[PDB]
Every structure is written in structure tokens, then in C-alpha cells.
């Protein structure tokens, strides 16, 4: 039955098509297991979300958007396995500036798909 | 992945069989007439 | 006579061999080919090539008229016959001379004088070369038979002149028992064959075969080229040849050659000749015969002398004198030659026809020569000789040469038909062969050790086979990924990764008749942990390509090794200098034809051959093992036997009919 | 280690009975269905973990995830017959509905 | 379908126009008739180094030549000889 | 530089026969008139110890009226004069 199922799927006449631009993949520049020490299990302590980003994006490359405005929120462009991604991460309490900065960023990503 | 082995149709006809000999002869004449 | 264009009246490796030398010398080359040889390597090797008709050699390569017609049409000044076919045909050599075409070989007189044993022995005896031999006698007087038995010297064998299978044979150890054994043999022969004629052939004690390469010229000057041991033969067929022959002193060989040289001058032989000698355990030698051609095993002579014997044949046929004096000739090192034969040693060395699906070869160096007339994908033919290639090596020492040949044989890979390569590996590693204790009965005497059965594989080999299968799947995944738009998706990896757990795959492999269960665990680092029964192995490796052959580089429990990997149909072939192992991938039942063929009735002809006997009428009750028909193919008798106890519905062939290979012979009533 | 326990489904007695009928274990079915060596993204492994007072329902009685079949990403939804005989608990329905929602939003073929 | 294509092609040797009728056979061979003589020709193009070579059999005689086609001239270089044939230029 | 002759007269020895032929762009039909043109295709016999080709031009080079038009020098070696001559023609 499992062999038959594989044959059925092969006859779906489907081919995947990508709407986004693609670039060659690259591993992050830092080990992922270091996230254990950086983050820990105590939610009262705070850490820089950029450290988490640096260990998951291709080549640890990140273009920050509105870095000095609403600094409690981090937004920027990166790539994961070649796919383009816009990252929004908390770095503190949300403020009016942070919400405005996020709203501006989300419009940018939607415009460019 | 397209490396799966699969079954194939068809069987080898009995060329010696009288039916096959007669059928081949009749169809061949039609094809020659067409040509 | 200026030889600027030569026709090669042969095929396969020997045609390529001659063309190589002709081309180096700047001589234009003309091939001939049958319909079956249209795409053969020698046709390509000679830009000029002509069809000589259908696949049967009697209608193609043995057709003197067609060969002469092509030589005239191509304006070839000379014909090189090679070995076999027309090379020892006196009528063909005289026809070449009548037509003004240079036959590159001995004169028609030398071919005829050597073609008849009694004539050749009489000439050799008159030339000083010894003529002693053990022979059968056609006289049937008890006194005459007894006098001949004394002359041959006891022990002797009495045999019936008619019949086979040991019937009417008696061993006579002394003169006193001769009369009783003769009357016993006669009574049995008369009862079995209605003939009481007895033969008297025996040899008291001369074991081992030695031959000498001799070269002559039109001038009549004659030279020798040391000697070759061809004692390792199966049914007279030479299997391994060596030069020089071991244990023969330089002084003894010099004398051995000189007596042969005088005979060569006596017939003023022109071109290469070989004096075949029988040598005893005391190194006394006697003339057996003279082959009036280039020998198949001439490469072992070339490797120890540094000569090209085909180049000398072309020069001497052009009329030039012998290039080097006997003083100039010098001997360095030792050399060996093994013939690769499309044969099944396990099935009594039956010849096998079929495709060369894989034909990997050892890399060639000046010491290692691959005399190959076939290429991968070539099909061996029922019409022509079954030889696939000949492997020759030269070394400073004979022991080193034996080591090099065995390493080289492992590198040679042949898939698609059975070969004698594993038999040659066992033979070349036999202690008596390593010692140089060879004689003509060597293969019969050591048959038990040379033919080796299969032994169960080690768990490491199974791990390597599983790794090869996994890597083949990974390669297939990469091939699919190449054509996809999502080139870098993590799904295209072959990591077999899971969330918070490890993937363990249950694989089954068949070694011989045994099913082996392997539990493979995909590790995060890319290695594999394989468990077979109670033992665990840490396996890591990759696939790399050298030339056209894929190689598997693996390490099992820290032990690293390299092997050639081929996966054909459901069998995994692993070739390593340690050895070769075949592992079978089980075939799912569903894929196997459901309703598999049943009640099969007709045993198929082993090959295309004449039907010599039919033992079954249109309606006859037969039991399994009842002989139905007898067929002769290339002079080899096969008896067809009843597969079932079913009564015979019909017979598709009658006596004297030629039946094609795998054609139904008998129809059995449905039960 | 908690996932390792959930990996065993109903238990040894249930697993032995399941195999005794000639059927493959649910996770072995997925292994054979997807392409050789391809990663499998399982979803909601902890559904039903201590959800019900006295009943243990490893993984909710259903295994869902995304894997590659014949080079195509598909959603695979397999009932775990070793867990309560494959009965549908309230969490089992929710887990399946979540899988279907994922398949529809991403146009992934569904294999049940 | 149901018929064989014969191409009428003209090549010029020296000052002489030659008409060759080539029938494209189903097997992949070509049957060519020049004047009253019919020739069965089969061939392939193979590359050694930077030189294309033509391996061809005419009436069963097999040969290899280096083929260069430059401008309107076909150049075949063989061990035996070199032949140059011209392709007529349309008005 | 100042070093002595490398080999003594006894050491010097004669082996075989060699022929040298100089290819020229001269056209024999116009009384060996020198010609200057582009070398669209140039090919030579394969190099080996017996066959030595000495050339100053490559395929794609253009011959020029400014200098002598010799295309190349071809050298072949063999045991006897006739065999060397046969190789020269083959080359
Ligand atoms: O016919 C082909 C060669 C081998 C068979 C010939 C047999 S051997 C017994 C008899 N004596 C001969 O000289 N020829 C036939």
C-alpha cells in the first residue's frame, strides 16, 4: 500500500514554483548550542535578541531597520536557507515608538512579498 | 525522487502459434495495400 | 618489397595488436569484418575496413576468396594472418603468392611439412631434434601388441579403439599380466562396441611442457628467444604461460634452442616459429611439434627480450635481415601471462556467451599490458573464440611478477558473464605454482583447491554494502535536486533527521541464502550506527569517482578502506584488493510478477547446435531425468533431460535439425 | 526523554498485538512512505500529554507531520491504532483539524 | 507517413555540377543515387581534439576523414587524399 | 658561457636517418609565389620522439608580407632512409 501511495503522488502532475528570490545558503557564524548559555531558563533576566538572530540566519547577516528608534523592538531583513525573511523580535517592553516601528516594517514586507 | 522500480505491461506473443501467423499475414497485406 | 599497406586477415585482440605495430611503422592498415564484427574495435582501429559476409567464420574469416578479393580491392601489398583462421592454411599462403600478395608468415612448404605429425617428426629427427614419443598401435596380434607394450615400457594402458567412458580399458603394470588384461579388455570391448581392436598408447615418465620462440628469415639465418613454460593447461588449453621457464639453466636453454635452431635452418623457415618440447623432471627434452605461426603467448617472450615479434614479422616479410645478432640479444627479469576466458570454472569450464555489462581494467604501465579486443558493452559471440583479454607482467624477479599479476587481477572487473579470473587468482596463489612445480596435469591434480566454494561474508562487508546503498540513494536525491527550482531546501538533504529523536532504519540484505537484518541509525554528525545481531558498528564514508568507476571510501569502527561499488539490478558489487563480495537486495513480492510462470515444460537448448538424437515419440510417458534429445554445439555434447513426470504432448524438432539457443524442444500435456 | 516515551505509543502489549496481525507500526509506515533519508517534520508531539485525568493518550492517538513523498511535500495524518485502539479523543480531532488547516493554507497534499 | 523522403541535392566538383538523390531510410542510413549508381551510406560525426571527424561506410567500405565546412566548400582530409567539394550559391 | 664541448668524438655516434621538410605559404602554381593570409585551420602530425614539428605559427594566426612566409619545419626519424621517407609522407 505504501508503494502504491508513492506512485499515486507521482501522478499528481504538480511542480513547485517559488515566488521569492533565492540566494545560496550559508551556515550561521556562531554555534547554535551557545543559545543554551545565552538564554537560560530564567525569564526575569534579559538577553539581546540579536544574539538569537545571529545564530539562525545565513552567515549571521542582518540589516536592521530603524535601529535607534523604538529600540525595545528589533526588525530587519535576513535570509534562512536562501529564503528572504523579515524578522520581528522583542527586546524589552513595548512602547508607542516600538509599535509604530513594527507597523511600518510589516507594511514593507507585505509590499515586497 | 524518481528511482522507484515499477512493473511493466506487455507479454511476449507466441510467434509459432497459428493464430499469430494468420493475424500477421492478414494485417501485413492490409498495410502493403495501404502503402 | 615496400610494405606501405597491410591487410589483417583476422579479428579481435590480434587484429588490434598487428594494427598497433603497423601504424607505428607508418604502414596503412586494412581490416576485414563479418556482419557480427561491424562495430568491433579492430574495424575502428583500421580506418580502412571491408565486409567479408555473415557471422559464421566458414563464410567470412575462413573464406580465402573474399580475403584475396579485399586485398586486391584495397591494394594491400601484404596480408598478416595473425593466429588461427588462415594463419596455418597452406592453400591460402600459396594463393597469396600466386596473386602477388606478400603472406606475412612462413612459406607454404613449411606450413605443410609441419601440419602432418609423422612428416614433422621425421624432419625433426633428421635435424637432430629428438623424436621420442608414446603412441597407439593399429596392429592387433597379441605378439605385436605385447612387443609394443615392452617398447613403451610398463606400466601401460590397454584401451578399445572404439568407444568412450572407460569401458574396455585395462592397466598393465608388468609383462606377466599383459595377456590376461588384453583378453579382459577385448571381451569388454567386443561386448560393448562389437569391436576387439585395441590401442597401445602410454608415456613412461616425462612430465612438463616447454616451448621455444624461434625466428627465421628468407636468407635462412635462424635465432631463438629463450623459452616459455605452458605446462598449466586445462584440457590442453593453455591458461597461464611464463617466460623464462622456471628451473631451466641458461646453459640448458641455450642447448635446447640450438638443436631447434638447426631444424629451423633445415626447413629454412622464414618468420616466427615455435618448437614445442616435452620436458621431463630431469630436464631431458624431446620435440613434440612446431607451430608454424605466431603463438598466442608471444607477449611473455616480448616482455623478457624487449622485442616486437609482429614488427620483425613485417620486416622479414618485406625482405630485410634479422635486426639483432644472437650476441646482441640479452635477457632481463621474468614475465607471466594469464588468459581471461568467458568460462564458468564451477560448471566444468563451460564457455559462456553474453554482454560485457561492466569491463573495468587495471591501469596499464610498461610492465602491465592489457591485450584487449573487447570494450564495455561488447557481446561475446557463440561463433568466435570466448577469450576476453590476456594479462602479461614483467618484473625483476619471478616472485615479484606473480605478486603484481595477482594485485592487477583484482583490479580487473567483469560483470555480465562468468569468467575464469577467480580461478586464475586461486591458481597463481597455489603453493606448488609459487614454487614453480608445474606439469601438464597440474590443474587435474590440484582441482580440489583451485575450485573454491563461496564463504559467508563478514559483518563489515554487510555494513559497507548498506552504506553503498544509502549513498546511492543520496546521489539519486542530489540528481533530483539538480532539476528543481528550490535548490537549497533542507528537505533535499539526506540527513534522515527527526525532532527530539533519532531515525533508525530497518534494512534487509541477502548474503547467499541468508537474510541479514541491519538496523541503521542516522546520526546528527552524518555518520551511521549499524547493528547486526549483537554487534554495533560506526560507519562513515562517501562516494568519489575515478575515471568512469565509482569508488566507496568508508571507515568501519575506525578501519578505513576503499572499494569499487557497482549496483546492477538487485545485486551490490564491492571490489576491493582484499576480494570481491556480492550482496543481493530483496525484491518486494508485489514488484515480482504475481502468478509467476508455472508448469514450464521445455528445457531450452544450451546453445545453437544440431540435434543428434531424439529419444521421445509424439506421445510418450517420461519421468524426471529421462533423456529427451542429444545436441552437439561447437563440438560439445549436451543431453536434454525430462523436467517433469508429465507425458509428452509434442516434439518441436527432429533429428538433424539445427535448434537455436533457448527455443522450446518438447511440449508437455497440461495436468 | 519524554518524547522517547511518547514514541512507544500504546505500549509493548499493544505493539505486540498490532504486529501480530501483520500490520506495520504507525511510525514505521511513515518511514517507508517518505523519500529515503528525507527529514520528517512532526507536529504537536505532546498533544494529550496529561490532558485527561487517568487516561494516557500518547500524541493524541494520531501522528501528523510534513514529509517528502516522490519529491513532493505532503501532509501525513496517520492514526495510531496502538493507542486506545485508534479511538478519536477530543484532542485527536483538534490535532487532525490543525493538520488539515496547515495543509490547506500551504497547498500540501493530504495523505491519510 | 506511408512514403520515403528523397532529397535532390546538387554539389559541384571542379566545374561539374553533380546531382545526388538521397533517400532517408527508416533505419537511419541514407541511400544515395548519383547517375546510374546507387550507394548505401551510413555515418556519424565524432570529435577528437578540436577537429570534427566523419566516420562513414559507403557500400560497406568504411573510412575516417577530417571534415571542415567553411564558406560554401566542404573539405574532407583523409590519409589517402584531400577532396574539396563546393556547395552551389543561390542567385 | 665558456664551457667545453659536451661530448668527445668517440662518444658521438650516428643512429638511423632523418628528413626535414619546410612548409611554406608559397603557391606552386604561380611559380612558388609567396602568399599572405589568415590560417583559419592549422593541424600537424602528432608530436613524438621520432616526429618533431618546429613551427612559429598557431591556428588563427595571420601570415604577413613583412617577413618570410615559412609556416613550419617538419622532422621525422627512423632506422633507414626509405622507412624515414615513408614516415615523412605519412606525416
Ligand atoms: O573436425 C574438426 C577438428 C576436430 C575433430 C576432427 C576429428 S579428431 C578425430 C579424427 N581425426 C582427424 O584427423 N580428424 C577427425
PDB file of N, CA, C and O in Angstrom, chain A residues 17-68:
ATOM      1  N   UNK A  17       6.756  25.904  -7.603  1.00  0.00           N
ATOM      2  CA  UNK A  17       7.242  27.163  -8.152  1.00  0.00           C
ATOM      3  C   UNK A  17       7.402  28.172  -7.028  1.00  0.00           C
ATOM      4  O   UNK A  17       6.533  28.280  -6.155  1.00  0.00           O
ATOM      5  N   UNK A  18       8.509  28.910  -7.051  1.00  0.00           N
ATOM      6  CA  UNK A  18       8.849  29.856  -5.997  1.00  0.00           C
ATOM      7  C   UNK A  18       8.538  31.278  -6.449  1.00  0.00           C
ATOM      8  O   UNK A  18       8.897  31.674  -7.563  1.00  0.00           O
ATOM      9  N   UNK A  19       7.873  32.040  -5.581  1.00  0.00           N
ATOM     10  CA  UNK A  19       7.563  33.438  -5.841  1.00  0.00           C
ATOM     11  C   UNK A  19       8.648  34.387  -5.349  1.00  0.00           C
ATOM     12  O   UNK A  19       8.609  35.576  -5.681  1.00  0.00           O
ATOM     13  N   UNK A  20       9.605  33.903  -4.566  1.00  0.00           N
ATOM     14  CA  UNK A  20      10.593  34.753  -3.918  1.00  0.00           C
ATOM     15  C   UNK A  20      11.946  34.558  -4.584  1.00  0.00           C
ATOM     16  O   UNK A  20      12.212  33.530  -5.216  1.00  0.00           O
ATOM     17  N   UNK A  21      12.801  35.567  -4.447  1.00  0.00           N
ATOM     18  CA  UNK A  21      14.173  35.450  -4.917  1.00  0.00           C
ATOM     19  C   UNK A  21      14.965  34.532  -3.995  1.00  0.00           C
ATOM     20  O   UNK A  21      14.696  34.432  -2.797  1.00  0.00           O
ATOM     21  N   UNK A  22      15.949  33.850  -4.571  1.00  0.00           N
ATOM     22  CA  UNK A  22      16.725  32.844  -3.856  1.00  0.00           C
ATOM     23  C   UNK A  22      18.202  33.177  -3.969  1.00  0.00           C
ATOM     24  O   UNK A  22      18.673  33.622  -5.022  1.00  0.00           O
ATOM     25  N   UNK A  23      18.931  32.967  -2.881  1.00  0.00           N
ATOM     26  CA  UNK A  23      20.373  33.139  -2.820  1.00  0.00           C
ATOM     27  C   UNK A  23      20.989  31.914  -2.178  1.00  0.00           C
ATOM     28  O   UNK A  23      20.330  31.205  -1.405  1.00  0.00           O
ATOM     29  N   UNK A  24      22.255  31.625  -2.478  1.00  0.00           N
ATOM     30  CA  UNK A  24      22.883  30.421  -1.924  1.00  0.00           C
ATOM     31  C   UNK A  24      22.869  30.428  -0.404  1.00  0.00           C
ATOM     32  O   UNK A  24      23.036  31.467   0.235  1.00  0.00           O
ATOM     33  N   UNK A  25      22.656  29.250   0.171  1.00  0.00           N
ATOM     34  CA  UNK A  25      22.577  29.118   1.616  1.00  0.00           C
ATOM     35  C   UNK A  25      23.959  29.214   2.257  1.00  0.00           C
ATOM     36  O   UNK A  25      24.980  28.890   1.647  1.00  0.00           O
ATOM     37  N   UNK A  26      23.974  29.677   3.505  1.00  0.00           N
ATOM     38  CA  UNK A  26      25.189  29.750   4.304  1.00  0.00           C
ATOM     39  C   UNK A  26      24.848  29.464   5.754  1.00  0.00           C
ATOM     40  O   UNK A  26      23.796  29.880   6.244  1.00  0.00           O
ATOM     41  N   UNK A  27      25.739  28.753   6.436  1.00  0.00           N
ATOM     42  CA  UNK A  27      25.548  28.463   7.845  1.00  0.00           C
ATOM     43  C   UNK A  27      25.815  29.705   8.689  1.00  0.00           C
ATOM     44  O   UNK A  27      26.602  30.575   8.309  1.00  0.00           O
ATOM     45  N   UNK A  28      25.162  29.810   9.846  1.00  0.00           N
ATOM     46  CA  UNK A  28      25.452  30.925  10.752  1.00  0.00           C
ATOM     47  C   UNK A  28      26.890  30.865  11.242  1.00  0.00           C
ATOM     48  O   UNK A  28      27.510  29.801  11.300  1.00  0.00           O
ATOM     49  N   UNK A  29      27.418  32.033  11.608  1.00  0.00           N
ATOM     50  CA  UNK A  29      28.816  32.143  12.007  1.00  0.00           C
ATOM     51  C   UNK A  29      29.058  31.723  13.449  1.00  0.00           C
ATOM     52  O   UNK A  29      30.217  31.711  13.883  1.00  0.00           O
ATOM     53  N   UNK A  30      28.013  31.386  14.201  1.00  0.00           N
ATOM     54  CA  UNK A  30      28.172  31.003  15.591  1.00  0.00           C
ATOM     55  C   UNK A  30      27.450  29.689  15.863  1.00  0.00           C
ATOM     56  O   UNK A  30      26.430  29.398  15.230  1.00  0.00           O
ATOM     57  N   UNK A  31      27.960  28.881  16.790  1.00  0.00           N
ATOM     58  CA  UNK A  31      27.286  27.618  17.115  1.00  0.00           C
ATOM     59  C   UNK A  31      25.898  27.858  17.687  1.00  0.00           C
ATOM     60  O   UNK A  31      25.656  28.838  18.396  1.00  0.00           O
ATOM     61  N   UNK A  32      24.980  26.947  17.370  1.00  0.00           N
ATOM     62  CA  UNK A  32      23.606  27.083  17.842  1.00  0.00           C
ATOM     63  C   UNK A  32      23.480  26.708  19.313  1.00  0.00           C
ATOM     64  O   UNK A  32      22.660  27.284  20.038  1.00  0.00           O
ATOM     65  N   UNK A  33      24.285  25.748  19.778  1.00  0.00           N
ATOM     66  CA  UNK A  33      24.174  25.298  21.162  1.00  0.00           C
ATOM     67  C   UNK A  33      24.558  26.382  22.156  1.00  0.00           C
ATOM     68  O   UNK A  33      24.222  26.266  23.338  1.00  0.00           O
ATOM     69  N   UNK A  34      25.252  27.432  21.712  1.00  0.00           N
ATOM     70  CA  UNK A  34      25.528  28.555  22.601  1.00  0.00           C
ATOM     71  C   UNK A  34      24.250  29.243  23.059  1.00  0.00           C
ATOM     72  O   UNK A  34      24.272  29.975  24.050  1.00  0.00           O
ATOM     73  N   UNK A  35      23.141  29.020  22.353  1.00  0.00           N
ATOM     74  CA  UNK A  35      21.863  29.584  22.774  1.00  0.00           C
ATOM     75  C   UNK A  35      21.476  29.108  24.170  1.00  0.00           C
ATOM     76  O   UNK A  35      20.733  29.797  24.878  1.00  0.00           O
ATOM     77  N   UNK A  36      21.963  27.934  24.580  1.00  0.00           N
ATOM     78  CA  UNK A  36      21.683  27.451  25.926  1.00  0.00           C
ATOM     79  C   UNK A  36      22.204  28.429  26.972  1.00  0.00           C
ATOM     80  O   UNK A  36      21.468  28.847  27.875  1.00  0.00           O
ATOM     81  N   UNK A  37      23.479  28.805  26.866  1.00  0.00           N
ATOM     82  CA  UNK A  37      24.050  29.731  27.828  1.00  0.00           C
ATOM     83  C   UNK A  37      23.475  31.130  27.714  1.00  0.00           C
ATOM     84  O   UNK A  37      23.255  31.805  28.722  1.00  0.00           O
ATOM     85  N   UNK A  38      23.233  31.589  26.486  1.00  0.00           N
ATOM     86  CA  UNK A  38      22.778  32.963  26.283  1.00  0.00           C
ATOM     87  C   UNK A  38      21.390  33.172  26.874  1.00  0.00           C
ATOM     88  O   UNK A  38      21.127  34.190  27.527  1.00  0.00           O
ATOM     89  N   UNK A  39      20.485  32.225  26.657  1.00  0.00           N
ATOM     90  CA  UNK A  39      19.079  32.387  27.016  1.00  0.00           C
ATOM     91  C   UNK A  39      18.792  31.871  28.420  1.00  0.00           C
ATOM     92  O   UNK A  39      18.193  32.572  29.237  1.00  0.00           O
ATOM     93  N   UNK A  40      19.213  30.645  28.722  1.00  0.00           N
ATOM     94  CA  UNK A  40      18.928  30.097  30.031  1.00  0.00           C
ATOM     95  C   UNK A  40      17.451  29.777  30.207  1.00  0.00           C
ATOM     96  O   UNK A  40      16.688  29.634  29.249  1.00  0.00           O
ATOM     97  N   UNK A  41      17.050  29.660  31.473  1.00  0.00           N
ATOM     98  CA  UNK A  41      15.677  29.330  31.829  1.00  0.00           C
ATOM     99  C   UNK A  41      15.024  30.365  32.732  1.00  0.00           C
ATOM    100  O   UNK A  41      13.866  30.181  33.127  1.00  0.00           O
ATOM    101  N   UNK A  42      15.720  31.448  33.074  1.00  0.00           N
ATOM    102  CA  UNK A  42      15.188  32.478  33.962  1.00  0.00           C
ATOM    103  C   UNK A  42      14.616  33.604  33.108  1.00  0.00           C
ATOM    104  O   UNK A  42      15.365  34.345  32.462  1.00  0.00           O
ATOM    105  N   UNK A  43      13.286  33.732  33.107  1.00  0.00           N
ATOM    106  CA  UNK A  43      12.635  34.757  32.301  1.00  0.00           C
ATOM    107  C   UNK A  43      12.834  36.160  32.871  1.00  0.00           C
ATOM    108  O   UNK A  43      12.617  37.139  32.147  1.00  0.00           O
ATOM    109  N   UNK A  44      13.230  36.279  34.137  1.00  0.00           N
ATOM    110  CA  UNK A  44      13.430  37.605  34.715  1.00  0.00           C
ATOM    111  C   UNK A  44      14.673  38.272  34.141  1.00  0.00           C
ATOM    112  O   UNK A  44      14.674  39.483  33.885  1.00  0.00           O
ATOM    113  N   UNK A  45      15.739  37.504  33.931  1.00  0.00           N
ATOM    114  CA  UNK A  45      16.911  38.038  33.251  1.00  0.00           C
ATOM    115  C   UNK A  45      16.583  38.332  31.792  1.00  0.00           C
ATOM    116  O   UNK A  45      15.707  37.709  31.190  1.00  0.00           O
ATOM    117  N   UNK A  46      17.296  39.300  31.231  1.00  0.00           N
ATOM    118  CA  UNK A  46      17.089  39.722  29.854  1.00  0.00           C
ATOM    119  C   UNK A  46      18.332  39.440  29.020  1.00  0.00           C
ATOM    120  O   UNK A  46      19.459  39.472  29.523  1.00  0.00           O
ATOM    121  N   UNK A  47      18.112  39.159  27.740  1.00  0.00           N
ATOM    122  CA  UNK A  47      19.186  38.917  26.789  1.00  0.00           C
ATOM    123  C   UNK A  47      18.894  39.679  25.509  1.00  0.00           C
ATOM    124  O   UNK A  47      17.760  40.089  25.248  1.00  0.00           O
ATOM    125  N   UNK A  48      19.932  39.875  24.704  1.00  0.00           N
ATOM    126  CA  UNK A  48      19.798  40.576  23.439  1.00  0.00           C
ATOM    127  C   UNK A  48      19.296  39.611  22.374  1.00  0.00           C
ATOM    128  O   UNK A  48      19.975  38.634  22.043  1.00  0.00           O
ATOM    129  N   UNK A  49      18.105  39.889  21.839  1.00  0.00           N
ATOM    130  CA  UNK A  49      17.526  39.027  20.818  1.00  0.00           C
ATOM    131  C   UNK A  49      18.413  38.937  19.587  1.00  0.00           C
ATOM    132  O   UNK A  49      18.350  37.952  18.849  1.00  0.00           O
ATOM    133  N   UNK A  50      19.249  39.955  19.350  1.00  0.00           N
ATOM    134  CA  UNK A  50      20.161  39.901  18.211  1.00  0.00           C
ATOM    135  C   UNK A  50      21.080  38.689  18.300  1.00  0.00           C
ATOM    136  O   UNK A  50      21.475  38.125  17.276  1.00  0.00           O
ATOM    137  N   UNK A  51      21.430  38.276  19.521  1.00  0.00           N
ATOM    138  CA  UNK A  51      22.258  37.087  19.683  1.00  0.00           C
ATOM    139  C   UNK A  51      21.548  35.849  19.148  1.00  0.00           C
ATOM    140  O   UNK A  51      22.168  34.995  18.504  1.00  0.00           O
ATOM    141  N   UNK A  52      20.247  35.734  19.413  1.00  0.00           N
ATOM    142  CA  UNK A  52      19.474  34.623  18.862  1.00  0.00           C
ATOM    143  C   UNK A  52      19.449  34.695  17.343  1.00  0.00           C
ATOM    144  O   UNK A  52      19.612  33.680  16.656  1.00  0.00           O
ATOM    145  N   UNK A  53      19.235  35.890  16.794  1.00  0.00           N
ATOM    146  CA  UNK A  53      19.193  36.052  15.344  1.00  0.00           C
ATOM    147  C   UNK A  53      20.532  35.671  14.722  1.00  0.00           C
ATOM    148  O   UNK A  53      20.582  35.008  13.680  1.00  0.00           O
ATOM    149  N   UNK A  54      21.633  36.084  15.352  1.00  0.00           N
ATOM    150  CA  UNK A  54      22.951  35.860  14.769  1.00  0.00           C
ATOM    151  C   UNK A  54      23.242  34.373  14.585  1.00  0.00           C
ATOM    152  O   UNK A  54      24.107  34.001  13.784  1.00  0.00           O
ATOM    153  N   UNK A  55      22.543  33.514  15.314  1.00  0.00           N
ATOM    154  CA  UNK A  55      22.830  32.084  15.292  1.00  0.00           C
ATOM    155  C   UNK A  55      21.822  31.269  14.494  1.00  0.00           C
ATOM    156  O   UNK A  55      21.846  30.038  14.580  1.00  0.00           O
ATOM    157  N   UNK A  56      20.936  31.905  13.729  1.00  0.00           N
ATOM    158  CA  UNK A  56      19.985  31.168  12.908  1.00  0.00           C
ATOM    159  C   UNK A  56      19.935  31.649  11.465  1.00  0.00           C
ATOM    160  O   UNK A  56      19.437  30.907  10.603  1.00  0.00           O
ATOM    161  N   UNK A  57      20.425  32.844  11.153  1.00  0.00           N
ATOM    162  CA  UNK A  57      20.311  33.395   9.812  1.00  0.00           C
ATOM    163  C   UNK A  57      21.562  33.048   9.017  1.00  0.00           C
ATOM    164  O   UNK A  57      22.640  32.811   9.566  1.00  0.00           O
ATOM    165  N   UNK A  58      21.415  33.011   7.692  1.00  0.00           N
ATOM    166  CA  UNK A  58      22.516  32.648   6.812  1.00  0.00           C
ATOM    167  C   UNK A  58      23.678  33.620   6.995  1.00  0.00           C
ATOM    168  O   UNK A  58      23.516  34.831   6.814  1.00  0.00           O
ATOM    169  N   UNK A  59      24.843  33.088   7.355  1.00  0.00           N
ATOM    170  CA  UNK A  59      26.024  33.908   7.514  1.00  0.00           C
ATOM    171  C   UNK A  59      25.958  34.931   8.621  1.00  0.00           C
ATOM    172  O   UNK A  59      26.834  35.791   8.706  1.00  0.00           O
ATOM    173  N   UNK A  60      24.945  34.860   9.486  1.00  0.00           N
ATOM    174  CA  UNK A  60      24.772  35.834  10.560  1.00  0.00           C
ATOM    175  C   UNK A  60      24.756  37.257  10.005  1.00  0.00           C
ATOM    176  O   UNK A  60      25.299  38.188  10.603  1.00  0.00           O
ATOM    177  N   UNK A  61      24.116  37.424   8.851  1.00  0.00           N
ATOM    178  CA  UNK A  61      23.988  38.718   8.198  1.00  0.00           C
ATOM    179  C   UNK A  61      22.583  39.255   8.445  1.00  0.00           C
ATOM    180  O   UNK A  61      21.600  38.539   8.249  1.00  0.00           O
ATOM    181  N   UNK A  62      22.504  40.512   8.872  1.00  0.00           N
ATOM    182  CA  UNK A  62      21.241  41.106   9.278  1.00  0.00           C
ATOM    183  C   UNK A  62      21.267  42.604   9.015  1.00  0.00           C
ATOM    184  O   UNK A  62      22.187  43.303   9.451  1.00  0.00           O
ATOM    185  N   UNK A  63      20.256  43.087   8.301  1.00  0.00           N
ATOM    186  CA  UNK A  63      20.100  44.506   8.004  1.00  0.00           C
ATOM    187  C   UNK A  63      18.992  45.050   8.898  1.00  0.00           C
ATOM    188  O   UNK A  63      17.810  44.806   8.648  1.00  0.00           O
ATOM    189  N   UNK A  64      19.378  45.789   9.930  1.00  0.00           N
ATOM    190  CA  UNK A  64      18.416  46.288  10.902  1.00  0.00           C
ATOM    191  C   UNK A  64      17.701  47.521  10.368  1.00  0.00           C
ATOM    192  O   UNK A  64      18.304  48.374   9.716  1.00  0.00           O
ATOM    193  N   UNK A  65      16.410  47.602  10.661  1.00  0.00           N
ATOM    194  CA  UNK A  65      15.555  48.691  10.212  1.00  0.00           C
ATOM    195  C   UNK A  65      15.144  49.535  11.412  1.00  0.00           C
ATOM    196  O   UNK A  65      14.598  49.004  12.386  1.00  0.00           O
ATOM    197  N   UNK A  66      15.412  50.836  11.342  1.00  0.00           N
ATOM    198  CA  UNK A  66      15.099  51.759  12.431  1.00  0.00           C
ATOM    199  C   UNK A  66      15.739  51.289  13.736  1.00  0.00           C
ATOM    200  O   UNK A  66      15.071  51.082  14.751  1.00  0.00           O
ATOM    201  N   UNK A  67      17.061  51.122  13.692  1.00  0.00           N
ATOM    202  CA  UNK A  67      17.771  50.519  14.816  1.00  0.00           C
ATOM    203  C   UNK A  67      17.645  51.362  16.081  1.00  0.00           C
ATOM    204  O   UNK A  67      17.448  50.823  17.173  1.00  0.00           O
ATOM    205  N   UNK A  68      17.763  52.681  15.956  1.00  0.00           N
ATOM    206  CA  UNK A  68      17.812  53.562  17.117  1.00  0.00           C
ATOM    207  C   UNK A  68      16.444  54.099  17.525  1.00  0.00           C
ATOM    208  O   UNK A  68      16.358  54.849  18.505  1.00  0.00           O
TER     209      UNK A  68
END
